PDB file of N, CA and C in Angstrom:
ATOM      1  N   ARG A 148       3.341   4.185  -8.015  1.00  0.00           N
ATOM      2  CA  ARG A 148       4.214   3.023  -7.918  1.00  0.00           C
ATOM      3  C   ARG A 148       3.498   1.837  -7.287  1.00  0.00           C
ATOM      4  N   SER A 149       2.498   2.096  -6.446  1.00  0.00           N
ATOM      5  CA  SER A 149       1.722   1.021  -5.842  1.00  0.00           C
ATOM      6  C   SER A 149       0.687   0.424  -6.787  1.00  0.00           C
ATOM      7  N   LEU A 150       0.486   1.008  -7.968  1.00  0.00           N
ATOM      8  CA  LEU A 150      -0.523   0.543  -8.911  1.00  0.00           C
ATOM      9  C   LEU A 150       0.054  -0.382  -9.977  1.00  0.00           C
ATOM     10  N   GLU A 151       1.103  -1.132  -9.646  1.00  0.00           N
ATOM     11  CA  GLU A 151       1.709  -2.046 -10.605  1.00  0.00           C
ATOM     12  C   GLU A 151       0.687  -3.092 -11.041  1.00  0.00           C
ATOM     13  N   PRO A 152       0.518  -3.324 -12.347  1.00  0.00           N
ATOM     14  CA  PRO A 152      -0.550  -4.230 -12.803  1.00  0.00           C
ATOM     15  C   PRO A 152      -0.425  -5.657 -12.303  1.00  0.00           C
ATOM     16  N   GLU A 153       0.794  -6.179 -12.145  1.00  0.00           N
ATOM     17  CA  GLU A 153       0.956  -7.574 -11.745  1.00  0.00           C
ATOM     18  C   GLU A 153       0.393  -7.820 -10.352  1.00  0.00           C
ATOM     19  N   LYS A 154       0.795  -6.995  -9.382  1.00  0.00           N
ATOM     20  CA  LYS A 154       0.311  -7.168  -8.017  1.00  0.00           C
ATOM     21  C   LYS A 154      -1.191  -6.938  -7.926  1.00  0.00           C
ATOM     22  N   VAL A 155      -1.701  -5.921  -8.624  1.00  0.00           N
ATOM     23  CA  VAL A 155      -3.134  -5.634  -8.588  1.00  0.00           C
ATOM     24  C   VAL A 155      -3.929  -6.812  -9.137  1.00  0.00           C
ATOM     25  N   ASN A 156      -3.510  -7.341 -10.290  1.00  0.00           N
ATOM     26  CA  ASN A 156      -4.223  -8.465 -10.893  1.00  0.00           C
ATOM     27  C   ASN A 156      -4.145  -9.712 -10.022  1.00  0.00           C
ATOM     28  N   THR A 157      -2.963 -10.009  -9.473  1.00  0.00           N
ATOM     29  CA  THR A 157      -2.818 -11.194  -8.632  1.00  0.00           C
ATOM     30  C   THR A 157      -3.678 -11.090  -7.380  1.00  0.00           C
ATOM     31  N   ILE A 158      -3.655  -9.929  -6.721  1.00  0.00           N
ATOM     32  CA  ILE A 158      -4.461  -9.732  -5.521  1.00  0.00           C
ATOM     33  C   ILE A 158      -5.942  -9.834  -5.855  1.00  0.00           C
ATOM     34  N   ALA A 159      -6.358  -9.251  -6.981  1.00  0.00           N
ATOM     35  CA  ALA A 159      -7.764  -9.288  -7.363  1.00  0.00           C
ATOM     36  C   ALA A 159      -8.239 -10.716  -7.613  1.00  0.00           C
ATOM     37  N   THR A 160      -7.481 -11.478  -8.408  1.00  0.00           N
ATOM     38  CA  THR A 160      -7.875 -12.853  -8.702  1.00  0.00           C
ATOM     39  C   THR A 160      -7.866 -13.709  -7.444  1.00  0.00           C
ATOM     40  N   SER A 161      -6.873 -13.510  -6.572  1.00  0.00           N
ATOM     41  CA  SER A 161      -6.813 -14.278  -5.335  1.00  0.00           C
ATOM     42  C   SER A 161      -7.989 -13.961  -4.421  1.00  0.00           C
ATOM     43  N   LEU A 162      -8.369 -12.685  -4.309  1.00  0.00           N
ATOM     44  CA  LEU A 162      -9.526 -12.331  -3.492  1.00  0.00           C
ATOM     45  C   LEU A 162     -10.802 -12.945  -4.052  1.00  0.00           C
ATOM     46  N   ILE A 163     -10.959 -12.927  -5.381  1.00  0.00           N
ATOM     47  CA  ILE A 163     -12.116 -13.574  -5.996  1.00  0.00           C
ATOM     48  C   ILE A 163     -12.142 -15.054  -5.641  1.00  0.00           C
ATOM     49  N   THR A 164     -10.997 -15.726  -5.770  1.00  0.00           N
ATOM     50  CA  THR A 164     -10.945 -17.158  -5.488  1.00  0.00           C
ATOM     51  C   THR A 164     -11.254 -17.455  -4.023  1.00  0.00           C
ATOM     52  N   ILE A 165     -10.716 -16.650  -3.108  1.00  0.00           N
ATOM     53  CA  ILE A 165     -10.854 -16.941  -1.684  1.00  0.00           C
ATOM     54  C   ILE A 165     -12.275 -16.670  -1.201  1.00  0.00           C
ATOM     55  N   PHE A 166     -12.843 -15.519  -1.559  1.00  0.00           N
ATOM     56  CA  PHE A 166     -14.063 -15.057  -0.909  1.00  0.00           C
ATOM     57  C   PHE A 166     -15.332 -15.256  -1.736  1.00  0.00           C
ATOM     58  N   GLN A 167     -15.270 -15.984  -2.849  1.00  0.00           N
ATOM     59  CA  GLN A 167     -16.463 -16.211  -3.660  1.00  0.00           C
ATOM     60  C   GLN A 167     -17.366 -17.234  -2.984  1.00  0.00           C
ATOM     61  N   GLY A 168     -18.571 -16.809  -2.613  1.00  0.00           N
ATOM     62  CA  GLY A 168     -19.530 -17.709  -2.004  1.00  0.00           C
ATOM     63  C   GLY A 168     -19.140 -18.239  -0.646  1.00  0.00           C
ATOM     64  N   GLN A 169     -18.209 -17.580   0.042  1.00  0.00           N
ATOM     65  CA  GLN A 169     -17.763 -17.997   1.361  1.00  0.00           C
ATOM     66  C   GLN A 169     -18.373 -17.157   2.474  1.00  0.00           C
ATOM     67  N   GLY A 170     -19.427 -16.398   2.176  1.00  0.00           N
ATOM     68  CA  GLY A 170     -20.080 -15.622   3.217  1.00  0.00           C
ATOM     69  C   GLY A 170     -20.726 -16.493   4.276  1.00  0.00           C
ATOM     70  N   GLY A 171     -21.377 -17.578   3.855  1.00  0.00           N
ATOM     71  CA  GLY A 171     -21.975 -18.490   4.814  1.00  0.00           C
ATOM     72  C   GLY A 171     -20.941 -19.202   5.665  1.00  0.00           C
ATOM     73  N   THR A 172     -19.830 -19.616   5.051  1.00  0.00           N
ATOM     74  CA  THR A 172     -18.759 -20.264   5.801  1.00  0.00           C
ATOM     75  C   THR A 172     -18.181 -19.329   6.857  1.00  0.00           C
ATOM     76  N   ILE A 173     -17.933 -18.070   6.493  1.00  0.00           N
ATOM     77  CA  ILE A 173     -17.387 -17.113   7.452  1.00  0.00           C
ATOM     78  C   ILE A 173     -18.413 -16.786   8.532  1.00  0.00           C
ATOM     79  N   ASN A 174     -19.697 -16.711   8.167  1.00  0.00           N
ATOM     80  CA  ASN A 174     -20.737 -16.505   9.173  1.00  0.00           C
ATOM     81  C   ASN A 174     -20.765 -17.650  10.178  1.00  0.00           C
ATOM     82  N   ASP A 175     -20.654 -18.887   9.692  1.00  0.00           N
ATOM     83  CA  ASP A 175     -20.608 -20.034  10.589  1.00  0.00           C
ATOM     84  C   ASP A 175     -19.370 -19.990  11.474  1.00  0.00           C
ATOM     85  N   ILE A 176     -18.221 -19.618  10.904  1.00  0.00           N
ATOM     86  CA  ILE A 176     -16.999 -19.489  11.698  1.00  0.00           C
ATOM     87  C   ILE A 176     -17.202 -18.479  12.818  1.00  0.00           C
ATOM     88  N   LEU A 177     -17.763 -17.315  12.483  1.00  0.00           N
ATOM     89  CA  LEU A 177     -17.963 -16.265  13.477  1.00  0.00           C
ATOM     90  C   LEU A 177     -18.922 -16.713  14.573  1.00  0.00           C
ATOM     91  N   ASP A 178     -20.040 -17.341  14.196  1.00  0.00           N
ATOM     92  CA  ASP A 178     -21.017 -17.776  15.193  1.00  0.00           C
ATOM     93  C   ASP A 178     -20.431 -18.832  16.123  1.00  0.00           C
ATOM     94  N   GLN A 179     -19.798 -19.857  15.547  1.00  0.00           N
ATOM     95  CA  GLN A 179     -19.250 -20.939  16.355  1.00  0.00           C
ATOM     96  C   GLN A 179     -18.127 -20.445  17.257  1.00  0.00           C
ATOM     97  N   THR A 180     -17.237 -19.594  16.733  1.00  0.00           N
ATOM     98  CA  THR A 180     -16.143 -19.104  17.560  1.00  0.00           C
ATOM     99  C   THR A 180     -16.646 -18.141  18.629  1.00  0.00           C
ATOM    100  N   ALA A 181     -17.696 -17.366  18.340  1.00  0.00           N
ATOM    101  CA  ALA A 181     -18.290 -16.509  19.357  1.00  0.00           C
ATOM    102  C   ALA A 181     -18.851 -17.338  20.499  1.00  0.00           C
ATOM    103  N   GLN A 182     -19.620 -18.378  20.170  1.00  0.00           N
ATOM    104  CA  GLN A 182     -20.218 -19.208  21.213  1.00  0.00           C
ATOM    105  C   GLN A 182     -19.148 -19.932  22.027  1.00  0.00           C
ATOM    106  N   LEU A 183     -18.159 -20.520  21.345  1.00  0.00           N
ATOM    107  CA  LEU A 183     -17.107 -21.256  22.040  1.00  0.00           C
ATOM    108  C   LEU A 183     -16.289 -20.342  22.944  1.00  0.00           C
ATOM    109  N   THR A 184     -15.887 -19.173  22.432  1.00  0.00           N
ATOM    110  CA  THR A 184     -15.065 -18.269  23.221  1.00  0.00           C
ATOM    111  C   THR A 184     -15.849 -17.642  24.364  1.00  0.00           C
ATOM    112  N   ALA A 185     -17.141 -17.362  24.170  1.00  0.00           N
ATOM    113  CA  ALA A 185     -17.953 -16.870  25.276  1.00  0.00           C
ATOM    114  C   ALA A 185     -18.081 -17.922  26.369  1.00  0.00           C
ATOM    115  N   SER A 186     -18.284 -19.186  25.983  1.00  0.00           N
ATOM    116  CA  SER A 186     -18.355 -20.252  26.977  1.00  0.00           C
ATOM    117  C   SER A 186     -17.037 -20.398  27.726  1.00  0.00           C
ATOM    118  N   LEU A 187     -15.914 -20.302  27.011  1.00  0.00           N
ATOM    119  CA  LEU A 187     -14.611 -20.401  27.664  1.00  0.00           C
ATOM    120  C   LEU A 187     -14.360 -19.224  28.602  1.00  0.00           C
ATOM    121  N   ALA A 188     -14.732 -18.012  28.183  1.00  0.00           N
ATOM    122  CA  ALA A 188     -14.513 -16.826  29.001  1.00  0.00           C
ATOM    123  C   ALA A 188     -15.453 -16.755  30.193  1.00  0.00           C
ATOM    124  N   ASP A 189     -16.592 -17.448  30.143  1.00  0.00           N
ATOM    125  CA  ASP A 189     -17.439 -17.548  31.326  1.00  0.00           C
ATOM    126  C   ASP A 189     -16.776 -18.322  32.458  1.00  0.00           C
ATOM    127  N   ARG A 190     -15.684 -19.033  32.181  1.00  0.00           N
ATOM    128  CA  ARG A 190     -14.907 -19.747  33.187  1.00  0.00           C
ATOM    129  C   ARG A 190     -13.554 -19.080  33.414  1.00  0.00           C
ATOM    130  N   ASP A 191     -13.529 -17.745  33.401  1.00  0.00           N
ATOM    131  CA  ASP A 191     -12.272 -17.014  33.553  1.00  0.00           C
ATOM    132  C   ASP A 191     -11.647 -17.270  34.920  1.00  0.00           C
ATOM    133  N   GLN A 192     -12.451 -17.173  35.981  1.00  0.00           N
ATOM    134  CA  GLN A 192     -11.941 -17.422  37.326  1.00  0.00           C
ATOM    135  C   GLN A 192     -11.477 -18.863  37.479  1.00  0.00           C
ATOM    136  N   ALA A 193     -12.230 -19.811  36.916  1.00  0.00           N
ATOM    137  CA  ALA A 193     -11.836 -21.212  36.985  1.00  0.00           C
ATOM    138  C   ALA A 193     -10.514 -21.451  36.267  1.00  0.00           C
ATOM    139  N   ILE A 194     -10.328 -20.834  35.098  1.00  0.00           N
ATOM    140  CA  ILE A 194      -9.071 -20.979  34.363  1.00  0.00           C
ATOM    141  C   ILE A 194      -7.918 -20.380  35.157  1.00  0.00           C
ATOM    142  N   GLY A 195      -8.138 -19.211  35.763  1.00  0.00           N
ATOM    143  CA  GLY A 195      -7.095 -18.604  36.577  1.00  0.00           C
ATOM    144  C   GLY A 195      -6.707 -19.461  37.767  1.00  0.00           C
ATOM    145  N   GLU A 196      -7.702 -20.033  38.451  1.00  0.00           N
ATOM    146  CA  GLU A 196      -7.422 -20.918  39.576  1.00  0.00           C
ATOM    147  C   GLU A 196      -6.703 -22.184  39.124  1.00  0.00           C
TER     148      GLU A 196
ATOM    149  N   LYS B 106      11.336  25.326 -14.299  1.00  0.00           N
ATOM    150  CA  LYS B 106      12.074  24.707 -13.211  1.00  0.00           C
ATOM    151  C   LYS B 106      12.831  25.770 -12.430  1.00  0.00           C
ATOM    152  N   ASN B 107      13.075  25.492 -11.151  1.00  0.00           N
ATOM    153  CA  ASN B 107      13.871  26.397 -10.334  1.00  0.00           C
ATOM    154  C   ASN B 107      14.518  25.619  -9.199  1.00  0.00           C
ATOM    155  N   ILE B 108      15.556  26.208  -8.617  1.00  0.00           N
ATOM    156  CA  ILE B 108      16.290  25.593  -7.516  1.00  0.00           C
ATOM    157  C   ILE B 108      15.820  26.215  -6.211  1.00  0.00           C
ATOM    158  N   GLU B 109      15.538  25.375  -5.220  1.00  0.00           N
ATOM    159  CA  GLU B 109      15.162  25.811  -3.883  1.00  0.00           C
ATOM    160  C   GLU B 109      16.250  25.407  -2.899  1.00  0.00           C
ATOM    161  N   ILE B 110      16.641  26.340  -2.035  1.00  0.00           N
ATOM    162  CA  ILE B 110      17.697  26.125  -1.055  1.00  0.00           C
ATOM    163  C   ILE B 110      17.089  26.229   0.335  1.00  0.00           C
ATOM    164  N   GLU B 111      17.345  25.225   1.166  1.00  0.00           N
ATOM    165  CA  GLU B 111      16.994  25.269   2.580  1.00  0.00           C
ATOM    166  C   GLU B 111      18.275  25.351   3.392  1.00  0.00           C
ATOM    167  N   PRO B 112      18.596  26.500   3.983  1.00  0.00           N
ATOM    168  CA  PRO B 112      19.859  26.623   4.719  1.00  0.00           C
ATOM    169  C   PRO B 112      19.838  25.829   6.015  1.00  0.00           C
ATOM    170  N   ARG B 113      20.967  25.190   6.314  1.00  0.00           N
ATOM    171  CA  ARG B 113      21.138  24.425   7.541  1.00  0.00           C
ATOM    172  C   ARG B 113      22.587  24.535   7.989  1.00  0.00           C
ATOM    173  N   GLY B 114      22.800  24.358   9.289  1.00  0.00           N
ATOM    174  CA  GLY B 114      24.132  24.340   9.853  1.00  0.00           C
ATOM    175  C   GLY B 114      24.644  25.720  10.227  1.00  0.00           C
ATOM    176  N   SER B 115      25.727  25.718  11.005  1.00  0.00           N
ATOM    177  CA  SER B 115      26.355  26.943  11.480  1.00  0.00           C
ATOM    178  C   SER B 115      27.569  27.360  10.663  1.00  0.00           C
ATOM    179  N   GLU B 116      28.252  26.414  10.026  1.00  0.00           N
ATOM    180  CA  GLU B 116      29.386  26.744   9.176  1.00  0.00           C
ATOM    181  C   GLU B 116      28.918  27.514   7.945  1.00  0.00           C
ATOM    182  N   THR B 117      29.779  28.400   7.452  1.00  0.00           N
ATOM    183  CA  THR B 117      29.469  29.248   6.309  1.00  0.00           C
ATOM    184  C   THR B 117      30.054  28.637   5.042  1.00  0.00           C
ATOM    185  N   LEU B 118      29.242  28.572   3.988  1.00  0.00           N
ATOM    186  CA  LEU B 118      29.676  28.016   2.711  1.00  0.00           C
ATOM    187  C   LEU B 118      30.527  29.050   1.986  1.00  0.00           C
ATOM    188  N   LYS B 119      31.811  28.748   1.821  1.00  0.00           N
ATOM    189  CA  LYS B 119      32.733  29.665   1.179  1.00  0.00           C
ATOM    190  C   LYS B 119      32.423  29.779  -0.313  1.00  0.00           C
ATOM    191  N   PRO B 120      32.863  30.863  -0.959  1.00  0.00           N
ATOM    192  CA  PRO B 120      32.679  30.977  -2.409  1.00  0.00           C
ATOM    193  C   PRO B 120      33.358  29.832  -3.144  1.00  0.00           C
ATOM    194  N   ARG B 121      32.750  29.437  -4.265  1.00  0.00           N
ATOM    195  CA  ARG B 121      33.151  28.279  -5.066  1.00  0.00           C
ATOM    196  C   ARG B 121      33.018  26.973  -4.288  1.00  0.00           C
ATOM    197  N   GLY B 122      32.201  26.969  -3.236  1.00  0.00           N
ATOM    198  CA  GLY B 122      31.934  25.745  -2.510  1.00  0.00           C
ATOM    199  C   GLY B 122      30.900  24.885  -3.212  1.00  0.00           C
ATOM    200  N   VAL B 123      30.963  23.585  -2.942  1.00  0.00           N
ATOM    201  CA  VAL B 123      30.142  22.595  -3.627  1.00  0.00           C
ATOM    202  C   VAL B 123      29.295  21.871  -2.593  1.00  0.00           C
ATOM    203  N   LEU B 124      27.982  21.873  -2.801  1.00  0.00           N
ATOM    204  CA  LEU B 124      27.091  21.057  -1.989  1.00  0.00           C
ATOM    205  C   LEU B 124      27.177  19.596  -2.428  1.00  0.00           C
ATOM    206  N   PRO B 125      27.263  18.662  -1.486  1.00  0.00           N
ATOM    207  CA  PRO B 125      27.367  17.247  -1.853  1.00  0.00           C
ATOM    208  C   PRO B 125      26.102  16.743  -2.532  1.00  0.00           C
ATOM    209  N   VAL B 126      26.270  15.658  -3.293  1.00  0.00           N
ATOM    210  CA  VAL B 126      25.149  15.061  -4.014  1.00  0.00           C
ATOM    211  C   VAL B 126      24.102  14.520  -3.047  1.00  0.00           C
ATOM    212  N   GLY B 127      24.513  14.145  -1.835  1.00  0.00           N
ATOM    213  CA  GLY B 127      23.571  13.644  -0.852  1.00  0.00           C
ATOM    214  C   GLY B 127      22.669  14.700  -0.252  1.00  0.00           C
ATOM    215  N   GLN B 128      22.977  15.979  -0.462  1.00  0.00           N
ATOM    216  CA  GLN B 128      22.158  17.080   0.023  1.00  0.00           C
ATOM    217  C   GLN B 128      21.294  17.693  -1.071  1.00  0.00           C
ATOM    218  N   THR B 129      21.256  17.087  -2.254  1.00  0.00           N
ATOM    219  CA  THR B 129      20.488  17.601  -3.376  1.00  0.00           C
ATOM    220  C   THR B 129      19.529  16.535  -3.886  1.00  0.00           C
ATOM    221  N   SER B 130      18.425  16.989  -4.479  1.00  0.00           N
ATOM    222  CA  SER B 130      17.403  16.097  -5.003  1.00  0.00           C
ATOM    223  C   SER B 130      16.957  16.584  -6.373  1.00  0.00           C
ATOM    224  N   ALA B 131      16.482  15.642  -7.193  1.00  0.00           N
ATOM    225  CA  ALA B 131      15.961  15.886  -8.527  1.00  0.00           C
ATOM    226  C   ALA B 131      14.438  15.797  -8.529  1.00  0.00           C
ATOM    227  N   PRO B 132      13.761  16.536  -9.405  1.00  0.00           N
ATOM    228  CA  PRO B 132      12.297  16.518  -9.401  1.00  0.00           C
ATOM    229  C   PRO B 132      11.737  15.222  -9.964  1.00  0.00           C
ATOM    230  N   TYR B 133      10.502  14.932  -9.566  1.00  0.00           N
ATOM    231  CA  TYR B 133       9.712  13.870 -10.177  1.00  0.00           C
ATOM    232  C   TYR B 133       8.929  14.491 -11.326  1.00  0.00           C
ATOM    233  N   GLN B 134       9.319  14.162 -12.553  1.00  0.00           N
ATOM    234  CA  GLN B 134       8.793  14.844 -13.725  1.00  0.00           C
ATOM    235  C   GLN B 134       7.313  14.542 -13.926  1.00  0.00           C
ATOM    236  N   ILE B 135       6.603  15.512 -14.505  1.00  0.00           N
ATOM    237  CA  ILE B 135       5.187  15.321 -14.800  1.00  0.00           C
ATOM    238  C   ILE B 135       5.005  14.260 -15.880  1.00  0.00           C
ATOM    239  N   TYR B 136       5.900  14.232 -16.871  1.00  0.00           N
ATOM    240  CA  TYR B 136       5.821  13.185 -17.884  1.00  0.00           C
ATOM    241  C   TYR B 136       6.118  11.815 -17.293  1.00  0.00           C
ATOM    242  N   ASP B 137       7.009  11.743 -16.299  1.00  0.00           N
ATOM    243  CA  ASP B 137       7.223  10.486 -15.588  1.00  0.00           C
ATOM    244  C   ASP B 137       5.959  10.040 -14.868  1.00  0.00           C
ATOM    245  N   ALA B 138       5.244  10.984 -14.251  1.00  0.00           N
ATOM    246  CA  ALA B 138       4.004  10.647 -13.562  1.00  0.00           C
ATOM    247  C   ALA B 138       2.962  10.113 -14.536  1.00  0.00           C
ATOM    248  N   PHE B 139       2.759  10.817 -15.655  1.00  0.00           N
ATOM    249  CA  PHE B 139       1.796  10.360 -16.655  1.00  0.00           C
ATOM    250  C   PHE B 139       2.186   9.000 -17.216  1.00  0.00           C
ATOM    251  N   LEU B 140       3.480   8.798 -17.472  1.00  0.00           N
ATOM    252  CA  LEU B 140       3.963   7.507 -17.944  1.00  0.00           C
ATOM    253  C   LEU B 140       3.636   6.405 -16.948  1.00  0.00           C
ATOM    254  N   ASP B 141       3.884   6.657 -15.660  1.00  0.00           N
ATOM    255  CA  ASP B 141       3.606   5.647 -14.643  1.00  0.00           C
ATOM    256  C   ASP B 141       2.127   5.289 -14.616  1.00  0.00           C
ATOM    257  N   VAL B 142       1.251   6.300 -14.579  1.00  0.00           N
ATOM    258  CA  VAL B 142      -0.186   6.023 -14.504  1.00  0.00           C
ATOM    259  C   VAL B 142      -0.641   5.232 -15.720  1.00  0.00           C
ATOM    260  N   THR B 143      -0.269   5.692 -16.916  1.00  0.00           N
ATOM    261  CA  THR B 143      -0.786   5.064 -18.125  1.00  0.00           C
ATOM    262  C   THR B 143      -0.240   3.653 -18.303  1.00  0.00           C
ATOM    263  N   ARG B 144       1.064   3.454 -18.086  1.00  0.00           N
ATOM    264  CA  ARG B 144       1.638   2.123 -18.242  1.00  0.00           C
ATOM    265  C   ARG B 144       1.099   1.153 -17.199  1.00  0.00           C
ATOM    266  N   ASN B 145       0.851   1.626 -15.974  1.00  0.00           N
ATOM    267  CA  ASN B 145       0.299   0.736 -14.958  1.00  0.00           C
ATOM    268  C   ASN B 145      -1.164   0.413 -15.231  1.00  0.00           C
ATOM    269  N   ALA B 146      -1.953   1.413 -15.632  1.00  0.00           N
ATOM    270  CA  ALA B 146      -3.371   1.188 -15.886  1.00  0.00           C
ATOM    271  C   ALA B 146      -3.608   0.369 -17.147  1.00  0.00           C
ATOM    272  N   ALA B 147      -2.674   0.400 -18.102  1.00  0.00           N
ATOM    273  CA  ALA B 147      -2.850  -0.384 -19.320  1.00  0.00           C
ATOM    274  C   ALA B 147      -2.805  -1.880 -19.042  1.00  0.00           C
ATOM    275  N   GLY B 148      -2.061  -2.299 -18.024  1.00  0.00           N
ATOM    276  CA  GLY B 148      -1.975  -3.695 -17.663  1.00  0.00           C
ATOM    277  C   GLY B 148      -3.011  -4.182 -16.679  1.00  0.00           C
ATOM    278  N   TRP B 149      -3.894  -3.306 -16.209  1.00  0.00           N
ATOM    279  CA  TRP B 149      -4.912  -3.711 -15.250  1.00  0.00           C
ATOM    280  C   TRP B 149      -5.940  -4.626 -15.896  1.00  0.00           C
ATOM    281  N   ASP B 150      -6.307  -5.684 -15.176  1.00  0.00           N
ATOM    282  CA  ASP B 150      -7.448  -6.520 -15.543  1.00  0.00           C
ATOM    283  C   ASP B 150      -8.652  -5.941 -14.812  1.00  0.00           C
ATOM    284  N   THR B 151      -9.319  -4.982 -15.458  1.00  0.00           N
ATOM    285  CA  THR B 151     -10.371  -4.222 -14.791  1.00  0.00           C
ATOM    286  C   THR B 151     -11.573  -5.086 -14.438  1.00  0.00           C
ATOM    287  N   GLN B 152     -11.837  -6.134 -15.218  1.00  0.00           N
ATOM    288  CA  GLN B 152     -12.912  -7.059 -14.876  1.00  0.00           C
ATOM    289  C   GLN B 152     -12.627  -7.755 -13.551  1.00  0.00           C
ATOM    290  N   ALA B 153     -11.392  -8.230 -13.371  1.00  0.00           N
ATOM    291  CA  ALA B 153     -11.013  -8.871 -12.118  1.00  0.00           C
ATOM    292  C   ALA B 153     -11.063  -7.892 -10.954  1.00  0.00           C
ATOM    293  N   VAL B 154     -10.626  -6.650 -11.179  1.00  0.00           N
ATOM    294  CA  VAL B 154     -10.649  -5.642 -10.121  1.00  0.00           C
ATOM    295  C   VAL B 154     -12.081  -5.358  -9.684  1.00  0.00           C
ATOM    296  N   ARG B 155     -12.982  -5.170 -10.653  1.00  0.00           N
ATOM    297  CA  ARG B 155     -14.376  -4.901 -10.321  1.00  0.00           C
ATOM    298  C   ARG B 155     -15.015  -6.087  -9.611  1.00  0.00           C
ATOM    299  N   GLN B 156     -14.725  -7.306 -10.076  1.00  0.00           N
ATOM    300  CA  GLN B 156     -15.262  -8.491  -9.418  1.00  0.00           C
ATOM    301  C   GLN B 156     -14.756  -8.607  -7.988  1.00  0.00           C
ATOM    302  N   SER B 157     -13.477  -8.302  -7.757  1.00  0.00           N
ATOM    303  CA  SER B 157     -12.926  -8.395  -6.409  1.00  0.00           C
ATOM    304  C   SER B 157     -13.539  -7.358  -5.481  1.00  0.00           C
ATOM    305  N   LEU B 158     -13.725  -6.129  -5.969  1.00  0.00           N
ATOM    306  CA  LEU B 158     -14.383  -5.116  -5.151  1.00  0.00           C
ATOM    307  C   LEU B 158     -15.808  -5.533  -4.806  1.00  0.00           C
TER     308      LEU B 158
END
């Protein structure tokens, strides 16, 4: 029942559209958010105060 | 095909007693299963599925 063709085809086409050639964009997102969040968390005591 | 009974409760079922429809179930037929698989797979866009994977 979970193998309905409409949902499978829609999900497949949407995944192709979303993630085609976006590996570099996601890598940049991960790197930038890692650096920003690490810098913010280095001020944990300051934020608490 | 065969009927399977799972006894429950303390009351005794008198002769000519009727089990309610809510306590009984019907099988999922093998032909229904084959129909589901084949009809669902016939509509698959396998190129899109492979590309997405």
